């Protein structure tokens, strides 16, 4: 059960997210080509670091 | 998202081969490439598909 470092590269606006969550696109700190989309709450900035745990799923709405 | 990407590529390949709304097609193509310029050169199975779209377009 590893932990992965990742970085937000670009923050979406118009997904139609619910409540204090915004979707965002991240590139892996490890494999800096592999890039996915996750959802996240809290004020979150372009080009910054985020820790995650479950590296499996592309987040829905 | 990225799983959705290559199927869209095949659709654009079909679009170019049976060309229609070609400025639209080129436009969305370039958008996909620029927003993911790294992961495409990471993958492999793009290669043949991208050659198809290259020739057709």
């Amino acid at each position: 059960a590893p932990v992965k470092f990742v970085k937000v590269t670009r923050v979406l606006g118009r997904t139609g997210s619910r409540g204090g969550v915004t979707q965002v696109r991240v590139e892996f700190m490890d494999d800096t080509t592999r890039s996915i989309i996750r959802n996240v709450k809290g004020p979150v900035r372009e080009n910054d670091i985020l820790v995650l745990l479950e590296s499996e799923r592309e987040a829905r709405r | 998202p990225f799983s959705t990407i290559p199927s869209l590529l095949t659709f654009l390949n079909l679009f170019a081969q049976r060309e229609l709304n070609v400025p639209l097609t080129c436009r969305i193509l370039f958008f996909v490439l620029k927003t993911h310029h790294k992961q495409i050169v990471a993958s492999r199975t793009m290669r043949a598909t991208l050659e198809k779209v290259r020739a057709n377009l």
């Binding site: 118009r14 997904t15 139609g16 709405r61 | 998202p1 959705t4 199927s7 095949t10 659709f11 079909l14």
Partner: peptide, 17 residues
């Protein structure tokens, strides 16, 4: 919901092809 709409439509067209 917009890109999601085109996502499912893409999926449907893949099945069609």
């Amino acid at each position: 919901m917009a890109g999601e709409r085109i996502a499912e439509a893409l999926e449907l067209g893949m099945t069609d092809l």
